[PDB]
Design a protein around this ligand. Structure first.
Ligand code: HPA
Ligand code: HPA
Lengths: 338, 338
DNA sequence: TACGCAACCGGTTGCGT
DNA sequence: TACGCAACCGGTTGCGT
């Protein structure tokens, strides 16, 4: 079709090309003609052809987990903005924590020749690590580790442990000693990590959390529901609960209300994520905020670099959690005694 | 690189090709050799090269609006599943209801030569319609119209008016006559449409909704908040509210709680969308459910068809809304008098 | 000066033998 | 029998003049 233009224009394709990508000087007349031709023929230049030639697709792939989940959803929306803004095309791929799906997506991606890769796999078993190395040649940055698990990628780290610690503290400082926790999957940073930071703060305070008080979530509202329930369903129940993520949080609020328990009057609840609607949870949720957007652009940035500045050495950027006080927490019984 | 394989294998590339795409018979030995070569060289065949040749990218583009919003998020997640499953690669593009962004994305898309296009633009001004026609050559289906606005595309229709009518009815049948509404943007189907179905049911019942009782939302929690507030902030207030979408709903629940109003004891509220967490809103939200997934796969399906079966005639499939009874509605004052 | 030639990127596939 | 030749898809870009 580029020939078709050149022909109408009575110039070479080489010419047509250059004008289109202003990559060398072209006489005005000449320029105009090509533009005209380009217009009547309704010419869209093939990017595949161009990619074939130039050796880069100008498109980047997101090998995610799930994309509906608030947390995830927010990051992705961010990522895209960034790609758009710097002319990159986004390939969204959800592997659902399934190795096969993951080997699958990884391969189409490579074949489609993505310029770089954004990785959000949630859980990372050896096998997954292994596959990843297999594609060390394609530039990449993992956005979900707590510390860097491999030398062949960039990493952005979130300080999930310092956010976890922040949560317990707040609780401690507000009057609490009988507290419960509903963590997310231990095979995850946001899971394991947040829990540990949260547990440290407790040891520091000589607060022991009885095992019947710790109930595993999976980040979904239902787990929030089940757990909150199992927690208060007991003879002896805490006065405060630390919940691994805002959505499960929102689930624990339901159940409490359903048991007829008052928040935060009967139980205070602290969240984690500061998701876009957390303020509209009822009551407005006090949670720890995770810089999602920065989490996004920061990853993009490291990627681009590696891409354009062809960096070869793995980098790792840290980002920081921060408390957001809302209305779901209340003074504990020990407030005045501090 | 295909040459590189052929060379190790001591066969022609033609050969190497065929074996890889089992597109003609190959002696076992021969086959093995190529596979071996393919292996040591760690060969990933270029899809761009192949696309260049075969004339199709095997990738489809989603020209969306926003992707974080529950509603949207859910559809997209669906769409992807479908693409994956039939070997298509997804290009997510959010135009944010901005013409430019939209002309922009539309063009990269064409240049990237997407096999087909999924369109979710929310509002459709002439200019936007116009651009769309400009690309009638690329197969497409709009997923968000109420009725079909153009002959050059497929459409999936949701019956937003029958869902709107369903909502009012329920209210009517539960005892209500003083009702309010917070609709979404009138420039949208889900906006305008739902409101009209809702308004019809009312005329039928000789129920007039006073203008101070109708407050525009924008589908976001905050509008839900502001409106619910402006509604109850009045001398005279309804006994029930119909809210255009679940999230804004979730916003109206906040405010009511914040004004110290009880749901549904002081005000019943009916939603619309049946979003994945609506059951966990507090109280669990009674809403009208929109088949999001079907809404998704159905679109994919029409697309593929047009793609593979090269259909030329615009098609249009209808999908159906349905009531979901939860805990946010209560008997109105006129229940017993029916 | 302002522009054109022809090889190249990496595969597919119709004819042959 | 089982496989190879060479043109083609649609652009880019080093040498020239
Ligand atoms: O893995 C996760 N899933 C959903 N929400 C989350 N928030 C933090 N981590 C996660
Ligand atoms: O345009 C919309 N935006 C967000 N949620 C929605 N639910 C229906 N339509 C919409």
């Amino acid at each position: 079709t580029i020939k078709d233009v050149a022909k109408r224009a009575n110039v070479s394709t080489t010419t047509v090309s250059h004008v289109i990508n202003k990559t060398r000087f072209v006489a005005e007349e000449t320029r105009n003609a090509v533009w005209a031709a380009i217009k009547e023929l309704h010419y869209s230049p093939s990017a595949v052809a161009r990619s074939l030639a130039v050796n880069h697709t100008k498109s980047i792939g997101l090998l995610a987990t799930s994309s509906e989940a608030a947390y995830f959803a927010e990051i992705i929306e961010a990522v895209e903005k960034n790609c758009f803004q710097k002319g990159y095309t986004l390939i969204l791929g959800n592997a659902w924590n399934n190795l096969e799906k993951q080997r699958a997506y990884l391969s189409m991606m490579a074949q489609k020749r993505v310029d770089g890769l954004l990785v959000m796999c949630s859980e990372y078993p050896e096998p997954l690590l292994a596959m990843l190395e297999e594609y060390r040649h394609i530039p990449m940055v993992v956005m979900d580790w707590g510390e860097a698990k491999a030398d062949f990628t960039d990493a952005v780290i979130d300080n999930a442990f310092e956010g976890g610690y922040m949560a317990g503290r707040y609780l401690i400082e507000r009057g609490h000693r009988e507290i419960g926790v509903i963590p997310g999957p231990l095979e995850r940073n946001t899971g394991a990590g947040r829990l540990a930071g949260f547990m440290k703060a407790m040891e520091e305070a000589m607060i022991k959390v009885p095992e019947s008080w710790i109930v595993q979530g999976d980040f979904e509202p239902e787990s929030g529901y089940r757990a909150m329930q199992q927690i208060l369903s007991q003879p002896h129940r805490p006065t405060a609960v630390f919940c691994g993520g805002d959505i499960m949080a929102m689930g624990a609020l339901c159940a409490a209300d359903e048991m007829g328990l008052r928040v935060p009057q009967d139980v205070s609840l602290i969240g984690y994520d500061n998701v876009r609607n957390a303020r509209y949870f009822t009551p407005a949720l006090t949670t720890i905020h995770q810089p999602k957007d920065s989490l996004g652009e920061t990853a993009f940035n490291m990627l681009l670099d590696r891409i354009v500045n062809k960096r070869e050495e793995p980098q790792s950027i840290e980002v920081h959690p921060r408390l957001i006080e809302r209305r779901s927490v209340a003074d504990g019984p020990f407030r005045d005694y501090r």
